[PDB]
PDB file of C-alpha atoms in Angstrom:
ATOM      1  CA  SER A   1     -12.787  20.833  -1.127  1.00  0.00           C
ATOM      2  CA  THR A   2     -14.702  18.683  -3.301  1.00  0.00           C
ATOM      3  CA  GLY A   3     -13.781  16.434  -6.685  1.00  0.00           C
ATOM      4  CA  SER A   4     -17.103  15.348  -9.760  1.00  0.00           C
ATOM      5  CA  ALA A   5     -16.218  13.233 -12.509  1.00  0.00           C
ATOM      6  CA  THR A   6     -18.348  11.803 -15.177  1.00  0.00           C
ATOM      7  CA  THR A   7     -18.072   7.769 -15.786  1.00  0.00           C
ATOM      8  CA  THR A   8     -19.218   6.688 -18.399  1.00  0.00           C
ATOM      9  CA  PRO A   9     -20.089   2.467 -19.879  1.00  0.00           C
ATOM     10  CA  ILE A  10     -17.019   0.846 -21.758  1.00  0.00           C
ATOM     11  CA  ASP A  11     -19.683  -1.304 -23.441  1.00  0.00           C
ATOM     12  CA  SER A  12     -23.155  -1.272 -24.691  1.00  0.00           C
ATOM     13  CA  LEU A  13     -24.296  -3.257 -21.716  1.00  0.00           C
ATOM     14  CA  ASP A  14     -22.866  -1.338 -18.703  1.00  0.00           C
ATOM     15  CA  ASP A  15     -20.558  -3.862 -18.330  1.00  0.00           C
ATOM     16  CA  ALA A  16     -17.997  -1.911 -16.412  1.00  0.00           C
ATOM     17  CA  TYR A  17     -17.803   2.043 -15.937  1.00  0.00           C
ATOM     18  CA  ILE A  18     -14.787   4.391 -16.702  1.00  0.00           C
ATOM     19  CA  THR A  19     -13.724   7.555 -14.984  1.00  0.00           C
ATOM     20  CA  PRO A  20     -10.728   9.358 -16.175  1.00  0.00           C
ATOM     21  CA  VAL A  21      -8.299  10.401 -13.710  1.00  0.00           C
ATOM     22  CA  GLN A  22      -4.948  12.147 -14.007  1.00  0.00           C
ATOM     23  CA  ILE A  23      -2.239  11.111 -12.453  1.00  0.00           C
ATOM     24  CA  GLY A  24       1.399  12.807 -12.587  1.00  0.00           C
ATOM     25  CA  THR A  25       3.404  15.926 -13.154  1.00  0.00           C
ATOM     26  CA  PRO A  26       2.467  17.024 -15.863  1.00  0.00           C
ATOM     27  CA  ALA A  27      -0.900  15.376 -16.135  1.00  0.00           C
ATOM     28  CA  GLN A  28      -1.656  11.793 -17.339  1.00  0.00           C
ATOM     29  CA  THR A  29      -4.858  10.845 -17.775  1.00  0.00           C
ATOM     30  CA  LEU A  30      -6.379   7.767 -17.443  1.00  0.00           C
ATOM     31  CA  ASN A  31      -9.165   5.786 -17.454  1.00  0.00           C
ATOM     32  CA  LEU A  32      -9.660   4.062 -14.239  1.00  0.00           C
ATOM     33  CA  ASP A  33     -12.457   1.694 -13.558  1.00  0.00           C
ATOM     34  CA  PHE A  34     -13.822   2.575  -9.374  1.00  0.00           C
ATOM     35  CA  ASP A  35     -14.048  -0.076  -7.323  1.00  0.00           C
ATOM     36  CA  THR A  36     -16.109  -0.022  -3.975  1.00  0.00           C
ATOM     37  CA  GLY A  37     -15.198  -3.984  -3.546  1.00  0.00           C
ATOM     38  CA  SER A  38     -11.686  -3.511  -3.353  1.00  0.00           C
ATOM     39  CA  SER A  39      -8.981  -1.061  -2.462  1.00  0.00           C
ATOM     40  CA  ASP A  40      -6.306  -0.484  -4.586  1.00  0.00           C
ATOM     41  CA  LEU A  41      -5.428   1.962  -6.963  1.00  0.00           C
ATOM     42  CA  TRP A  42      -3.185  -0.094  -9.538  1.00  0.00           C
ATOM     43  CA  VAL A  43      -2.387   1.211 -13.609  1.00  0.00           C
ATOM     44  CA  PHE A  44      -1.170  -0.132 -16.547  1.00  0.00           C
ATOM     45  CA  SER A  45       2.214   1.385 -16.727  1.00  0.00           C
ATOM     46  CA  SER A  46       5.601   1.449 -19.093  1.00  0.00           C
ATOM     47  CA  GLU A  47       6.399  -1.825 -16.370  1.00  0.00           C
ATOM     48  CA  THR A  48       3.717  -3.722 -17.022  1.00  0.00           C
ATOM     49  CA  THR A  49       4.690  -7.148 -19.725  1.00  0.00           C
ATOM     50  CA  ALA A  50       4.561  -5.072 -23.515  1.00  0.00           C
ATOM     51  CA  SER A  51       2.881  -8.947 -24.435  1.00  0.00           C
ATOM     52  CA  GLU A  52       0.077  -7.883 -22.036  1.00  0.00           C
ATOM     53  CA  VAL A  53      -0.585  -4.600 -22.891  1.00  0.00           C
ATOM     54  CA  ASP A  54      -2.752  -4.145 -25.614  1.00  0.00           C
ATOM     55  CA  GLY A  55      -5.031  -0.543 -26.228  1.00  0.00           C
ATOM     56  CA  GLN A  56      -4.496   0.282 -22.763  1.00  0.00           C
ATOM     57  CA  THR A  57      -3.045   3.828 -22.046  1.00  0.00           C
ATOM     58  CA  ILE A  58      -0.356   3.401 -19.890  1.00  0.00           C
ATOM     59  CA  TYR A  59       1.356   5.538 -16.831  1.00  0.00           C
ATOM     60  CA  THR A  60       5.395   6.210 -17.018  1.00  0.00           C
ATOM     61  CA  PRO A  61       6.452   7.170 -13.661  1.00  0.00           C
ATOM     62  CA  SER A  62       9.752   8.305 -15.393  1.00  0.00           C
ATOM     63  CA  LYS A  63       8.134  11.452 -17.007  1.00  0.00           C
ATOM     64  CA  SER A  64       6.220  12.239 -13.707  1.00  0.00           C
ATOM     65  CA  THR A  65       8.635  15.153 -12.015  1.00  0.00           C
ATOM     66  CA  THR A  66       6.359  14.376  -8.709  1.00  0.00           C
ATOM     67  CA  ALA A  67       7.038  10.446  -9.146  1.00  0.00           C
ATOM     68  CA  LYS A  68       8.970   8.781  -6.858  1.00  0.00           C
ATOM     69  CA  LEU A  69       9.224   5.230  -6.274  1.00  0.00           C
ATOM     70  CA  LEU A  70       7.892   3.178  -2.674  1.00  0.00           C
ATOM     71  CA  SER A  71      10.986   1.614  -2.284  1.00  0.00           C
ATOM     72  CA  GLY A  72      10.604  -2.101  -1.349  1.00  0.00           C
ATOM     73  CA  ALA A  73       6.830  -1.842  -1.704  1.00  0.00           C
ATOM     74  CA  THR A  74       5.258  -4.563  -4.215  1.00  0.00           C
ATOM     75  CA  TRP A  75       1.203  -6.094  -4.119  1.00  0.00           C
ATOM     76  CA  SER A  76      -0.235  -8.740  -5.587  1.00  0.00           C
ATOM     77  CA  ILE A  77      -4.600  -9.106  -5.897  1.00  0.00           C
ATOM     78  CA  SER A  78      -6.985 -10.876  -6.777  1.00  0.00           C
ATOM     79  CA  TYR A  79     -10.323 -10.631  -7.491  1.00  0.00           C
ATOM     80  CA  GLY A  80     -13.846 -11.997  -7.699  1.00  0.00           C
ATOM     81  CA  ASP A  81     -14.340 -12.946 -11.060  1.00  0.00           C
ATOM     82  CA  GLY A  82     -10.474 -15.165 -11.176  1.00  0.00           C
ATOM     83  CA  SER A  83      -8.741 -12.084 -12.154  1.00  0.00           C
ATOM     84  CA  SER A  84      -5.525 -10.732 -11.097  1.00  0.00           C
ATOM     85  CA  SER A  85      -2.880  -8.084 -11.309  1.00  0.00           C
ATOM     86  CA  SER A  86       0.766  -7.378  -9.202  1.00  0.00           C
ATOM     87  CA  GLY A  87       3.320  -5.377  -9.505  1.00  0.00           C
ATOM     88  CA  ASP A  88       5.868  -2.442  -7.778  1.00  0.00           C
ATOM     89  CA  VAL A  89       4.455   0.867  -6.398  1.00  0.00           C
ATOM     90  CA  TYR A  90       5.413   4.609  -6.825  1.00  0.00           C
ATOM     91  CA  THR A  91       3.421   7.642  -4.807  1.00  0.00           C
ATOM     92  CA  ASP A  92       2.170  10.523  -6.626  1.00  0.00           C
ATOM     93  CA  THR A  93      -0.275  13.369  -7.253  1.00  0.00           C
ATOM     94  CA  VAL A  94      -3.571  12.066  -8.485  1.00  0.00           C
ATOM     95  CA  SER A  95      -6.744  13.993  -8.982  1.00  0.00           C
ATOM     96  CA  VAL A  96      -9.774  13.205  -9.723  1.00  0.00           C
ATOM     97  CA  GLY A  97     -12.669  15.127 -11.250  1.00  0.00           C
ATOM     98  CA  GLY A  98     -10.943  18.884  -9.633  1.00  0.00           C
ATOM     99  CA  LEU A  99      -9.527  17.088  -6.241  1.00  0.00           C
ATOM    100  CA  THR A 100      -5.808  16.231  -5.745  1.00  0.00           C
ATOM    101  CA  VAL A 101      -4.647  14.386  -3.621  1.00  0.00           C
ATOM    102  CA  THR A 102      -0.488  14.565  -3.012  1.00  0.00           C
ATOM    103  CA  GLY A 103       1.748  11.140  -2.455  1.00  0.00           C
ATOM    104  CA  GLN A 104      -1.258   8.640  -3.373  1.00  0.00           C
ATOM    105  CA  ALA A 105       0.432   5.398  -3.496  1.00  0.00           C
ATOM    106  CA  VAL A 106      -0.163   4.125  -7.560  1.00  0.00           C
ATOM    107  CA  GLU A 107       0.171   0.102  -7.998  1.00  0.00           C
ATOM    108  CA  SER A 108       2.184  -0.054 -11.311  1.00  0.00           C
ATOM    109  CA  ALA A 109       1.651  -3.370 -12.845  1.00  0.00           C
ATOM    110  CA  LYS A 110       3.949  -5.440 -13.953  1.00  0.00           C
ATOM    111  CA  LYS A 111       1.397  -8.298 -14.566  1.00  0.00           C
ATOM    112  CA  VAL A 112      -1.914  -8.411 -15.741  1.00  0.00           C
ATOM    113  CA  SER A 113      -4.240 -11.595 -15.738  1.00  0.00           C
ATOM    114  CA  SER A 114      -5.440 -12.257 -19.786  1.00  0.00           C
ATOM    115  CA  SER A 115      -9.090 -10.550 -18.950  1.00  0.00           C
ATOM    116  CA  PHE A 116      -7.422  -7.227 -18.316  1.00  0.00           C
ATOM    117  CA  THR A 117      -5.240  -7.301 -21.507  1.00  0.00           C
ATOM    118  CA  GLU A 118      -8.427  -8.012 -23.652  1.00  0.00           C
ATOM    119  CA  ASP A 119     -10.008  -5.281 -22.330  1.00  0.00           C
ATOM    120  CA  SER A 120      -8.694  -1.930 -23.734  1.00  0.00           C
ATOM    121  CA  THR A 121     -10.940   0.645 -22.305  1.00  0.00           C
ATOM    122  CA  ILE A 122     -10.207   0.142 -18.868  1.00  0.00           C
ATOM    123  CA  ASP A 123      -6.130   1.689 -17.845  1.00  0.00           C
ATOM    124  CA  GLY A 124      -7.184   0.456 -14.314  1.00  0.00           C
ATOM    125  CA  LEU A 125      -8.477  -0.104 -11.362  1.00  0.00           C
ATOM    126  CA  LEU A 126      -9.208   2.912  -8.191  1.00  0.00           C
ATOM    127  CA  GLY A 127     -10.439   1.205  -5.063  1.00  0.00           C
ATOM    128  CA  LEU A 128     -12.733   2.651  -2.649  1.00  0.00           C
ATOM    129  CA  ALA A 129     -13.439  -0.016  -0.379  1.00  0.00           C
ATOM    130  CA  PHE A 130     -11.905   0.182   3.291  1.00  0.00           C
ATOM    131  CA  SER A 131      -8.145   0.900   2.749  1.00  0.00           C
ATOM    132  CA  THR A 132      -7.707  -2.541   5.287  1.00  0.00           C
ATOM    133  CA  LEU A 133      -8.408  -4.596   1.732  1.00  0.00           C
ATOM    134  CA  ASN A 134      -5.097  -2.818   0.301  1.00  0.00           C
ATOM    135  CA  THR A 135      -2.800  -5.364  -0.516  1.00  0.00           C
ATOM    136  CA  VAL A 136       0.644  -3.238  -0.353  1.00  0.00           C
ATOM    137  CA  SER A 137       3.479  -5.294   1.101  1.00  0.00           C
ATOM    138  CA  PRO A 138       5.433  -4.514   3.569  1.00  0.00           C
ATOM    139  CA  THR A 139       3.185  -1.135   3.958  1.00  0.00           C
ATOM    140  CA  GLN A 140      -0.038  -1.183   3.600  1.00  0.00           C
ATOM    141  CA  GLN A 141      -1.394   2.067   1.399  1.00  0.00           C
ATOM    142  CA  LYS A 142      -4.235   4.264   1.469  1.00  0.00           C
ATOM    143  CA  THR A 143      -7.352   4.585  -0.728  1.00  0.00           C
ATOM    144  CA  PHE A 144      -7.121   7.801  -2.638  1.00  0.00           C
ATOM    145  CA  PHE A 145     -11.090   8.057  -0.547  1.00  0.00           C
ATOM    146  CA  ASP A 146      -8.904   7.854   2.857  1.00  0.00           C
ATOM    147  CA  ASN A 147      -6.411   9.970   1.764  1.00  0.00           C
ATOM    148  CA  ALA A 148      -8.948  12.349   0.405  1.00  0.00           C
ATOM    149  CA  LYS A 149     -11.135  12.562   3.509  1.00  0.00           C
ATOM    150  CA  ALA A 150      -9.385  15.363   6.157  1.00  0.00           C
ATOM    151  CA  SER A 151      -9.721  18.197   3.229  1.00  0.00           C
ATOM    152  CA  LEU A 152     -12.882  17.287   1.627  1.00  0.00           C
ATOM    153  CA  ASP A 153     -16.135  18.983   3.036  1.00  0.00           C
ATOM    154  CA  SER A 154     -18.352  16.098   4.540  1.00  0.00           C
ATOM    155  CA  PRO A 155     -16.369  12.395   4.694  1.00  0.00           C
ATOM    156  CA  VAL A 156     -18.014  10.946   1.563  1.00  0.00           C
ATOM    157  CA  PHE A 157     -18.674   9.695  -1.704  1.00  0.00           C
ATOM    158  CA  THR A 158     -21.683   9.236  -4.014  1.00  0.00           C
ATOM    159  CA  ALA A 159     -22.118   6.970  -7.320  1.00  0.00           C
ATOM    160  CA  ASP A 160     -24.214   7.933  -9.169  1.00  0.00           C
ATOM    161  CA  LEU A 161     -24.378   4.897 -12.148  1.00  0.00           C
ATOM    162  CA  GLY A 162     -26.177   5.810 -15.531  1.00  0.00           C
ATOM    163  CA  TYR A 163     -28.486   3.116 -17.487  1.00  0.00           C
ATOM    164  CA  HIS A 164     -26.647   3.084 -20.761  1.00  0.00           C
ATOM    165  CA  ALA A 165     -25.802   6.134 -20.507  1.00  0.00           C
ATOM    166  CA  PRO A 166     -23.339   8.514 -18.351  1.00  0.00           C
ATOM    167  CA  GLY A 167     -23.287   9.051 -14.309  1.00  0.00           C
ATOM    168  CA  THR A 168     -21.324  10.824 -11.721  1.00  0.00           C
ATOM    169  CA  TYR A 169     -18.519  10.275  -8.929  1.00  0.00           C
ATOM    170  CA  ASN A 170     -18.886  12.689  -6.509  1.00  0.00           C
ATOM    171  CA  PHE A 171     -16.396  13.486  -3.397  1.00  0.00           C
ATOM    172  CA  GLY A 172     -17.294  15.459  -0.536  1.00  0.00           C
ATOM    173  CA  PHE A 173     -20.880  16.822  -1.004  1.00  0.00           C
ATOM    174  CA  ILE A 174     -24.269  15.195  -1.510  1.00  0.00           C
ATOM    175  CA  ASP A 175     -25.940  16.872  -4.914  1.00  0.00           C
ATOM    176  CA  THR A 176     -29.371  17.884  -3.604  1.00  0.00           C
ATOM    177  CA  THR A 177     -30.662  17.807  -7.831  1.00  0.00           C
ATOM    178  CA  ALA A 178     -29.475  14.214  -8.360  1.00  0.00           C
ATOM    179  CA  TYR A 179     -31.996  12.578  -6.908  1.00  0.00           C
ATOM    180  CA  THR A 180     -35.616  12.497  -5.906  1.00  0.00           C
ATOM    181  CA  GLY A 181     -37.177  11.631  -2.525  1.00  0.00           C
ATOM    182  CA  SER A 182     -35.715  11.212   0.491  1.00  0.00           C
ATOM    183  CA  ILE A 183     -31.760   9.832   1.067  1.00  0.00           C
ATOM    184  CA  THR A 184     -32.630   6.306   3.150  1.00  0.00           C
ATOM    185  CA  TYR A 185     -29.313   5.158   5.298  1.00  0.00           C
ATOM    186  CA  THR A 186     -28.355   2.295   6.547  1.00  0.00           C
ATOM    187  CA  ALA A 187     -25.640   0.397   8.953  1.00  0.00           C
ATOM    188  CA  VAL A 188     -22.319  -0.510   7.497  1.00  0.00           C
ATOM    189  CA  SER A 189     -19.824  -3.224   8.544  1.00  0.00           C
ATOM    190  CA  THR A 190     -16.241  -2.670   7.558  1.00  0.00           C
ATOM    191  CA  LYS A 191     -15.156  -6.039   9.331  1.00  0.00           C
ATOM    192  CA  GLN A 192     -14.322  -7.599   6.264  1.00  0.00           C
ATOM    193  CA  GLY A 193     -12.977  -4.147   4.590  1.00  0.00           C
ATOM    194  CA  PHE A 194     -16.364  -3.795   2.467  1.00  0.00           C
ATOM    195  CA  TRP A 195     -19.396  -1.525   2.624  1.00  0.00           C
ATOM    196  CA  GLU A 196     -21.642  -4.243   3.633  1.00  0.00           C
ATOM    197  CA  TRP A 197     -24.840  -3.461   4.818  1.00  0.00           C
ATOM    198  CA  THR A 198     -28.189  -5.403   5.150  1.00  0.00           C
ATOM    199  CA  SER A 199     -30.952  -4.927   2.841  1.00  0.00           C
ATOM    200  CA  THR A 200     -34.532  -5.732   4.146  1.00  0.00           C
ATOM    201  CA  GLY A 201     -36.065  -7.816   1.741  1.00  0.00           C
ATOM    202  CA  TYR A 202     -37.319  -7.991  -2.541  1.00  0.00           C
ATOM    203  CA  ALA A 203     -39.844  -8.399  -4.171  1.00  0.00           C
ATOM    204  CA  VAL A 204     -40.303  -9.544  -7.887  1.00  0.00           C
ATOM    205  CA  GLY A 205     -42.269  -7.124 -10.290  1.00  0.00           C
ATOM    206  CA  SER A 206     -45.648  -6.663  -8.860  1.00  0.00           C
ATOM    207  CA  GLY A 207     -45.728  -9.021  -6.515  1.00  0.00           C
ATOM    208  CA  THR A 208     -45.568  -8.688  -2.909  1.00  0.00           C
ATOM    209  CA  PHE A 209     -42.482  -7.122  -0.883  1.00  0.00           C
ATOM    210  CA  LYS A 210     -40.925 -10.261   1.207  1.00  0.00           C
ATOM    211  CA  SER A 211     -39.700  -8.770   4.481  1.00  0.00           C
ATOM    212  CA  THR A 212     -35.919 -10.694   5.046  1.00  0.00           C
ATOM    213  CA  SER A 213     -32.426  -9.889   5.953  1.00  0.00           C
ATOM    214  CA  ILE A 214     -29.955  -9.969   3.196  1.00  0.00           C
ATOM    215  CA  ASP A 215     -26.139  -8.876   3.656  1.00  0.00           C
ATOM    216  CA  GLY A 216     -24.037  -7.902   0.815  1.00  0.00           C
ATOM    217  CA  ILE A 217     -21.794  -5.232  -0.210  1.00  0.00           C
ATOM    218  CA  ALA A 218     -22.378  -2.191  -2.249  1.00  0.00           C
ATOM    219  CA  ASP A 219     -19.379  -3.061  -5.149  1.00  0.00           C
ATOM    220  CA  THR A 220     -19.343  -0.969  -8.482  1.00  0.00           C
ATOM    221  CA  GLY A 221     -16.615  -3.064  -9.111  1.00  0.00           C
ATOM    222  CA  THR A 222     -18.972  -5.965  -9.764  1.00  0.00           C
ATOM    223  CA  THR A 223     -21.811  -6.198 -13.021  1.00  0.00           C
ATOM    224  CA  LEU A 224     -24.257  -8.066 -11.843  1.00  0.00           C
ATOM    225  CA  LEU A 225     -26.872  -8.328  -8.738  1.00  0.00           C
ATOM    226  CA  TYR A 226     -25.905 -11.639  -6.497  1.00  0.00           C
ATOM    227  CA  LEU A 227     -28.331 -12.788  -4.578  1.00  0.00           C
ATOM    228  CA  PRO A 228     -28.802 -15.807  -2.895  1.00  0.00           C
ATOM    229  CA  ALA A 229     -30.283 -18.718  -4.416  1.00  0.00           C
ATOM    230  CA  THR A 230     -33.652 -18.825  -2.530  1.00  0.00           C
ATOM    231  CA  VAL A 231     -34.355 -15.316  -4.350  1.00  0.00           C
ATOM    232  CA  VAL A 232     -33.002 -15.567  -7.334  1.00  0.00           C
ATOM    233  CA  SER A 233     -35.108 -18.739  -8.403  1.00  0.00           C
ATOM    234  CA  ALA A 234     -38.425 -17.124  -7.002  1.00  0.00           C
ATOM    235  CA  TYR A 235     -37.329 -14.336  -9.457  1.00  0.00           C
ATOM    236  CA  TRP A 236     -36.632 -16.199 -12.749  1.00  0.00           C
ATOM    237  CA  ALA A 237     -39.363 -18.453 -11.575  1.00  0.00           C
ATOM    238  CA  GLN A 238     -42.040 -15.422 -13.496  1.00  0.00           C
ATOM    239  CA  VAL A 239     -39.931 -15.363 -16.382  1.00  0.00           C
ATOM    240  CA  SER A 240     -41.267 -18.286 -18.724  1.00  0.00           C
ATOM    241  CA  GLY A 241     -38.429 -20.671 -20.671  1.00  0.00           C
ATOM    242  CA  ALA A 242     -35.658 -19.091 -17.512  1.00  0.00           C
ATOM    243  CA  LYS A 243     -33.816 -22.039 -16.282  1.00  0.00           C
ATOM    244  CA  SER A 244     -30.127 -21.953 -14.583  1.00  0.00           C
ATOM    245  CA  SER A 245     -27.196 -23.045 -17.147  1.00  0.00           C
ATOM    246  CA  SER A 246     -24.265 -24.798 -16.045  1.00  0.00           C
ATOM    247  CA  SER A 247     -23.300 -25.030 -19.195  1.00  0.00           C
ATOM    248  CA  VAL A 248     -23.494 -20.982 -19.696  1.00  0.00           C
ATOM    249  CA  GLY A 249     -22.640 -20.302 -15.986  1.00  0.00           C
ATOM    250  CA  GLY A 250     -26.022 -18.793 -14.728  1.00  0.00           C
ATOM    251  CA  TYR A 251     -29.508 -17.634 -15.525  1.00  0.00           C
ATOM    252  CA  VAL A 252     -30.360 -17.405 -19.216  1.00  0.00           C
ATOM    253  CA  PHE A 253     -33.933 -16.829 -20.091  1.00  0.00           C
ATOM    254  CA  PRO A 254     -35.359 -16.106 -24.088  1.00  0.00           C
ATOM    255  CA  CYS A 255     -34.222 -13.144 -25.611  1.00  0.00           C
ATOM    256  CA  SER A 256     -38.591 -12.197 -26.197  1.00  0.00           C
ATOM    257  CA  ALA A 257     -39.302 -12.325 -22.963  1.00  0.00           C
ATOM    258  CA  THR A 258     -40.249  -9.183 -20.964  1.00  0.00           C
ATOM    259  CA  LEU A 259     -38.579  -9.303 -17.663  1.00  0.00           C
ATOM    260  CA  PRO A 260     -40.112  -8.048 -14.134  1.00  0.00           C
ATOM    261  CA  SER A 261     -38.798  -5.497 -11.994  1.00  0.00           C
ATOM    262  CA  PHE A 262     -36.386  -6.257  -8.734  1.00  0.00           C
ATOM    263  CA  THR A 263     -37.096  -4.110  -5.672  1.00  0.00           C
ATOM    264  CA  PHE A 264     -34.925  -4.524  -2.858  1.00  0.00           C
ATOM    265  CA  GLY A 265     -35.571  -3.112   1.039  1.00  0.00           C
ATOM    266  CA  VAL A 266     -33.637  -0.410   2.356  1.00  0.00           C
ATOM    267  CA  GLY A 267     -34.768   0.056   5.632  1.00  0.00           C
ATOM    268  CA  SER A 268     -38.424   0.505   4.913  1.00  0.00           C
ATOM    269  CA  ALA A 269     -37.588   2.588   1.873  1.00  0.00           C
ATOM    270  CA  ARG A 270     -37.665   0.291  -1.566  1.00  0.00           C
ATOM    271  CA  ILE A 271     -35.221   0.500  -4.586  1.00  0.00           C
ATOM    272  CA  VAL A 272     -36.719  -0.708  -7.778  1.00  0.00           C
ATOM    273  CA  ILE A 273     -35.037  -2.449 -10.447  1.00  0.00           C
ATOM    274  CA  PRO A 274     -36.708  -1.947 -13.947  1.00  0.00           C
ATOM    275  CA  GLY A 275     -36.610  -5.292 -15.268  1.00  0.00           C
ATOM    276  CA  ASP A 276     -34.815  -3.560 -18.702  1.00  0.00           C
ATOM    277  CA  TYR A 277     -31.492  -3.374 -16.469  1.00  0.00           C
ATOM    278  CA  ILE A 278     -31.526  -7.311 -15.690  1.00  0.00           C
ATOM    279  CA  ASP A 279     -31.157  -8.242 -19.681  1.00  0.00           C
ATOM    280  CA  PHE A 280     -27.724  -9.035 -20.275  1.00  0.00           C
ATOM    281  CA  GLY A 281     -28.366  -9.340 -23.921  1.00  0.00           C
ATOM    282  CA  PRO A 282     -27.438 -12.877 -26.285  1.00  0.00           C
ATOM    283  CA  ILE A 283     -24.778 -15.136 -24.293  1.00  0.00           C
ATOM    284  CA  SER A 284     -22.815 -15.458 -28.146  1.00  0.00           C
ATOM    285  CA  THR A 285     -23.234 -13.562 -30.584  1.00  0.00           C
ATOM    286  CA  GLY A 286     -26.795 -14.022 -32.351  1.00  0.00           C
ATOM    287  CA  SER A 287     -28.495 -16.369 -29.802  1.00  0.00           C
ATOM    288  CA  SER A 288     -31.753 -16.236 -28.955  1.00  0.00           C
ATOM    289  CA  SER A 289     -30.642 -17.177 -25.247  1.00  0.00           C
ATOM    290  CA  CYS A 290     -30.114 -14.096 -23.071  1.00  0.00           C
ATOM    291  CA  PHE A 291     -28.317 -13.461 -19.457  1.00  0.00           C
ATOM    292  CA  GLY A 292     -29.532 -12.920 -16.492  1.00  0.00           C
ATOM    293  CA  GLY A 293     -28.513  -9.765 -14.790  1.00  0.00           C
ATOM    294  CA  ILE A 294     -29.845 -11.321 -10.804  1.00  0.00           C
ATOM    295  CA  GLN A 295     -27.560 -14.315 -10.216  1.00  0.00           C
ATOM    296  CA  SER A 296     -26.979 -16.967  -7.507  1.00  0.00           C
ATOM    297  CA  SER A 297     -23.976 -15.986  -4.788  1.00  0.00           C
ATOM    298  CA  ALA A 298     -23.931 -19.730  -4.066  1.00  0.00           C
ATOM    299  CA  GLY A 299     -20.671 -20.687  -4.204  1.00  0.00           C
ATOM    300  CA  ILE A 300     -18.893 -16.961  -4.068  1.00  0.00           C
ATOM    301  CA  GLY A 301     -19.601 -16.770  -0.319  1.00  0.00           C
ATOM    302  CA  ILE A 302     -21.035 -13.191  -0.032  1.00  0.00           C
ATOM    303  CA  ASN A 303     -24.223 -11.251  -1.747  1.00  0.00           C
ATOM    304  CA  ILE A 304     -23.106  -8.842  -3.703  1.00  0.00           C
ATOM    305  CA  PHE A 305     -25.211  -5.424  -5.035  1.00  0.00           C
ATOM    306  CA  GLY A 306     -23.304  -4.560  -8.507  1.00  0.00           C
ATOM    307  CA  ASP A 307     -24.147  -2.041 -10.872  1.00  0.00           C
ATOM    308  CA  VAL A 308     -27.421  -3.712 -12.192  1.00  0.00           C
ATOM    309  CA  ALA A 309     -28.305  -2.710  -8.685  1.00  0.00           C
ATOM    310  CA  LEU A 310     -27.015   0.202  -7.642  1.00  0.00           C
ATOM    311  CA  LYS A 311     -27.167   2.624 -10.976  1.00  0.00           C
ATOM    312  CA  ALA A 312     -30.717   1.868 -10.071  1.00  0.00           C
ATOM    313  CA  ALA A 313     -29.877   4.401  -7.348  1.00  0.00           C
ATOM    314  CA  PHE A 314     -28.052   7.394  -5.879  1.00  0.00           C
ATOM    315  CA  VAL A 315     -25.790   5.615  -3.439  1.00  0.00           C
ATOM    316  CA  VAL A 316     -23.791   7.559  -0.846  1.00  0.00           C
ATOM    317  CA  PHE A 317     -20.747   5.949   0.579  1.00  0.00           C
ATOM    318  CA  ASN A 318     -20.402   7.683   4.335  1.00  0.00           C
ATOM    319  CA  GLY A 319     -17.172   7.699   5.371  1.00  0.00           C
ATOM    320  CA  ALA A 320     -17.415   9.698   8.919  1.00  0.00           C
ATOM    321  CA  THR A 321     -16.302   7.813  11.487  1.00  0.00           C
ATOM    322  CA  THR A 322     -19.385   5.889  11.322  1.00  0.00           C
ATOM    323  CA  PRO A 323     -19.657   4.629   8.385  1.00  0.00           C
ATOM    324  CA  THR A 324     -23.264   4.325   6.579  1.00  0.00           C
ATOM    325  CA  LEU A 325     -24.595   4.159   3.258  1.00  0.00           C
ATOM    326  CA  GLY A 326     -27.836   5.763   2.056  1.00  0.00           C
ATOM    327  CA  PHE A 327     -29.597   5.172  -1.227  1.00  0.00           C
ATOM    328  CA  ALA A 328     -32.304   7.700  -2.778  1.00  0.00           C
ATOM    329  CA  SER A 329     -34.644   6.932  -6.005  1.00  0.00           C
ATOM    330  CA  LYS A 330     -33.653   8.841  -9.001  1.00  0.00           C
TER     331      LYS A 330
END
């Protein structure tokens, strides 16, 4: 089997991407944030505290003939940005882009933090990291990908995120028309439950490539590119007037600037992030200070190849017995 679904930016900054997902019978379609940095599929629901729902589409398990309470199971998750959610669990039929999993754990939110309430465009998350990170207790549950894997033509999914445009998540096949050149594969460590890999270095603009190992995660659920302070300082030093602002919470730059590109290494291959991808616009409406898309990972504890980086590539998440990651230009 295979699946193919379009993923669409939630706003003009590509802050996140939503993908329609069919849950239950008859189908209830919710727009979920596919997150390769976590491993819970959770939704706004008829159980979510009413004051914490503001415009989201909810899953109502009582209206699904295939929903079953997973008795005694609860979940609770906290994300890197400080947001959180928690609740109980149903199993139900879940389909993405024509690919159907029966018996999928659908985590129903009883509580969500303010960041989720305030984002009316995201109806929940669909985790695509390794199932060892799943938060359901006392019986840990599998991700949609883990459940689908055995049925897939090939044990892979791909992320093809757009810059200010829709893109695609495919399951079970590699679309050889969706990228240019060849795909370069690189080793993955699953020790922390993430799609963790080591970049071979970087360049700023037209500068020389610096060969250096940068361990980090491929995380579709993180907006920006978070790298070591040394790397980030070298990038912003090439932008006149750029500075790190503790009051704003990172590097800012004059909105009048033209940003240089940023290149990262994948083995001997190179992925180029155009300068425009690194512009996240005014810090507040009407400001001439703009927020940078490359930020320091210092104090996160991990480097994160978020959407800024991933959208510059066609990315293969290979979930074979020995997992790997592939990157191609596009």
